[PDB]
């Protein structure tokens, strides 16, 4: 009996309390306010040095949280590396979607560097100078460091504290190999006719109609780890080819990740920075269920590069309402739905695949 | 949606929006939609050979007790000589093969007012429509209806305080998912409903941590409300599938198999992994075979001091009833013969 909480209603001014399990929507707070505590300054420095001595030149980021962690750590890490006489410099760029997967893993050094600090927020005083050898974190550096020499998914979250004025995150370096997404920050719940699969960057909702189905999703990233089966509801009798969000894109292997008449969206607009999956027509558009439509393929935006909308769309076997994506660039359609009258070469498409 | 919570172990508090699952193991108000529809359904079932009802859970039994007087008032007002008798609940609630019908028309006379202001009691009639009790000889199990109601309220909402039920149109086998809530967060998970609260934890592997049951249902836990349903055998679940135990890896423990012959006759158990007061259990491969669950005290109150298991795992599986502290099927006494102890007379 440690997790006690209350819930409030703002239209009736009443409150119910009790004990149980509480799952919070933390997706919309992709915030830099957090303060990050990787393994240790000396320990992280020794691990990165051993990785450089092993022939690993860089890192692919699992999610935005690791990218922000590297940005917050890089300066002090460089300073402590210089204070130990190691000619190496860490350069951190931005993330690009989808976040592809690397085959290497960081090592766990037997001993750390015996010169430097003991805490991450302690002190970063003297800035380091650029060095010949650069250990580059993700960015537009695929030429000087290919993906095959680039590590991925090397950190293990230990504690997610919630203080009065700030919230802090504690990390370590994994002893053993892993393919799954970190389970310490995953929360799944179902009650009645509604369910949620969620973590720090995903918030996926389901509903019970005649059949359980996907209702809407809100993604602020497209990671490529595997959703653990222990944090998934109804993981049997489901084919990987039916999941709306592909299994390669960290979509849960669940009956809650389906929709009747649609198949896996391997060719959706996965290049965006943030998208939301909705089941309705795009603004000023309309779709027909007629057999004589075209074969499914890459997803198409509803507005031409000139800014003109299209008012004719068809699908062969889809079910109303249609599957539509929502990025800042516009309102894409699903792979099933194709233009009815206009040629498809006049429209912009998705050049990525899962 | 909006709420706040406290964590006493980590000493932190927080607020926000999300999804909350509470421990409900009364706060809510359970009565059927229409008394006249229920009266018509009962009469039509009686005319077609169906004589009794076996409750799925305690909630249905409480609802029947609340509604029986008004139901008899409607039955007597309409010229029908039928009596509804409601008795106590004996665990486990066994499953009946019949179902209540849906009447095409309701009774011509009566009132749909939830509560009956008129306390005019009807005269006892020689025809009895018994609800669950010690009445297995007036109405045997083969003529009893079971799981005939649909809880027609759902959702993540938590401020309603009023639950409505109606007779369903389609046959069903599963526990009603309107009152089921399961949740996992980090290293702790729960499978729960109005009567079950089953907890699992993340050790080197996921396993059963502790359970707290206040009834013994025999419906089937829905697969849509279960975590990690694949790659699991039915012979490994600690709580058997026949007793509405979820078919999941969270319902397992290393070195143990399904407890088909545990003390399910009791009225409230508490499964946990530790010794009974003043007892120790050893690990010797020469111990006995799996069999019925035995208490730690004899019929006179004498506490046994020596138990063995062949291939179990410390700490030992034990049940905490109100009148004893039993063990699992794999733990047997080292010295005392078993023919004088008390063992469970029920099987799943």
């Amino acid at each position, epitope marked *: 009996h440690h997790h006690h909480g209350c819930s409030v209603d703002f239209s009736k001014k009443e409150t119910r309390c009790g004990t149980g399990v509480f799952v919070y929507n933390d997706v919309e707070a992709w915030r830099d306010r957090y303060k990050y505590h990787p393994d240790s300054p000396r320990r992280l420095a020794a691990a990165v040095k051993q990785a450089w001595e092993d022939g690993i030149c860089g890192i692919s980021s699992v999610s935005r949280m690791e990218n922000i962690m590297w940005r917050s750590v890089e300066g002090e890490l460089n300073a402590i590396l210089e204070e130990n006489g190691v000619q190496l410099t860490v350069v951190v760029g931005s993330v690009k979607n989808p976040m592809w997967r690397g085959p290497q893993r960081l090592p766990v050094p037997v001993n750390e560097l015996p010169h430097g600090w003991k805490a991450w927020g302690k002190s970063y005083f003297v800035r380091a100078a650029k060095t010949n050898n650069s250990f580059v974190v993700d960015g537009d550096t695929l030429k000087e460091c290919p993906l095959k020499h680039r590590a991925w998914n090397s950190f293990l979250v230990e504690d997610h504290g919630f203080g009065v004025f700030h919230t802090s995150v504690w990390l370590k370096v994994r002893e053993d190999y892993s393919l799954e997404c970190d389970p310490a920050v995953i929360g799944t719940a179902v009650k009645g006719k509604e369910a949620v699969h969620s973590d720090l960057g995903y918030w996926i909702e389901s509903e019970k109609n005649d*059949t359980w189905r996907l209702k809407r999703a809100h993604l602020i990233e497209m990671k490529t780890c595997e959703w653990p089966k222990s944090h998934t509801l109804w993981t049997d009798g489901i084919e990987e080819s039916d999941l709306i969000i592909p299994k390669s894109l960290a979509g849960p292997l669940s*009956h809650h990740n389906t929709r009747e008449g649609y198949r896996t969206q391997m060719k959706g607009p996965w290049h965006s920075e943030e998208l939301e999956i909705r089941f309705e027509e795009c603004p000023g558009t309309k779709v027909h269920v007629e057999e004589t439509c075209g074969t499914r393929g890459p997803s198409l935006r509803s507005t031409t590069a000139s800014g003109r909308v299209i008012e004719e769309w068809c699908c062969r076997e889809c079910t109303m309402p249609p599957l539509s994506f929502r990025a800042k660039d516009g309102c894409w359609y699903g792979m099933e739905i194709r233009p009815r009258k206009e040629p498809e070469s006049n429209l912009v498409r998705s050049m990525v695949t899962a | 949606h909006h709420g706040c919570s406290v964590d006493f172990s980590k000493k932190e508090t927080r607020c926000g929006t999300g999804v909350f699952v509470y421990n409900d193991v009364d706060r809510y108000k359970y009565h059927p939609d229409s008394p006249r529809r229920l009266a018509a359904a009962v009469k039509q079932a009686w005319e077609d050979g169906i004589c009794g009802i076996s409750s799925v859970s305690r909630m249905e039994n409480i609802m029947w007790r609340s509604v029986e007087g008004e139901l008899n008032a409607i039955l007597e007002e309409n010229g029908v000589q039928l009596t509804v008798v409601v008795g106590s609940v004996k665990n486990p609630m066994w499953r009946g093969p019949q179902r209540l019908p849906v009447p095409v028309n309701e009774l011509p006379h009566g009132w749909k007012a939830w509560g009956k202001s008129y306390f005019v009691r009807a005269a006892k009639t020689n025809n009895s429509f018994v609800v669950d009790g010690d009445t297995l000889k007036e109405c045997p*199990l083969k003529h009893r209806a079971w799981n005939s109601f649909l809880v027609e309220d759902h959702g993540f909402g938590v401020f309603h305080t009023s639950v409505w039920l109606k007779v369903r149109e389609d046959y069903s086998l599963e526990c009603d998912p309107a009152v089921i809530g399961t949740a996992v967060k980090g290293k702790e998970a729960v499978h729960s409903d109005l009567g079950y609260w089953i907890e699992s934890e993340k050790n080197d592997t996921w396993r059963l941590k502790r359970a707290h049951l206040i009834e013994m249902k025999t419906c089937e836990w829905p697969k*849509s409300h279960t975590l990690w349903t694949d790659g699991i055998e039915e012979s490994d679940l600690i709580i058997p599938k026949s007793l509405a135990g979820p078919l999941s890896h969270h319902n397992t423990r290393e070195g143990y198999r399904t407890q088909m012959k545990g003390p399910w006759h009791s009225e409230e158990l508490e499964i946990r992994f530790e010794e009974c007061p003043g007892t120790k259990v050893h690990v010797e491969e020469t111990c006995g075979t799996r069999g019925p669950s035995l208490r730690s005290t004899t019929a006179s109150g004498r506490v046994i001091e020596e138990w063995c298991c062949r291939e179990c795992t410390m700490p030992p599986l034990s049940f905490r009833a109100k009148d004893g502290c039993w063990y699992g099927m794999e733990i047997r006494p080292r010295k005392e013969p078993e023919s004088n102890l008390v063992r469970s007379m029920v*099987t799943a």
Partner: antibody
Amino acid sequence: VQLLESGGGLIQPGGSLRLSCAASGLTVSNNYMNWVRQAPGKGLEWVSIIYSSGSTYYADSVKGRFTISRDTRKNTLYLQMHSLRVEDTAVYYCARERGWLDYWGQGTLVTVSS
Amino acid sequence: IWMTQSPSSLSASVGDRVTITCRASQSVSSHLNWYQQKPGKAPKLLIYAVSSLQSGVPSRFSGGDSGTDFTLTIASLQPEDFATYYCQQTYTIPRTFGQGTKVEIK
């Protein structure tokens, strides 16, 4: 009501077949539906079941090869069959279950040989 | 739950009483059904819930027994009542049938 099976015929070993059961008088989304087979000159055998909630179960003989399914719009059952063996030759029925099988189909014939 | 049905075959003339016996290796609550199948035709449900009779089935059929055993009884062996009979349990997955009992004209 009336249920009618389809898709039966002749297939060589290792081939794939897909049966259908068209339902009239009842909708399949609110019913428990079974598939039952009977090898020529032998007794009845249970194959698979789908609940009204969508849960599926299979026999140990066909597990990993057969897949029961349904479609809401067309109101029909399906039974996808893969890696067919010689011992899969029988007559296949679809049925409705409410505690008992009270509505059977006519049956369809599946033969596996060369 | 395995179901053993005896006798394997039966022969008797018109007007006699014949009883078919089914056994279950475990406990079934009351979920036992009796079916009748004729050559070339789909099976037909006769008795359900141990004793409950199905509509349209004549009154010559009745089932039910005490203990771990179940029986199906024929009142008057009409000459259109020669077929194979099976017992089924609908209590546990997997569903199981009996091997069948053939009733032939004597």
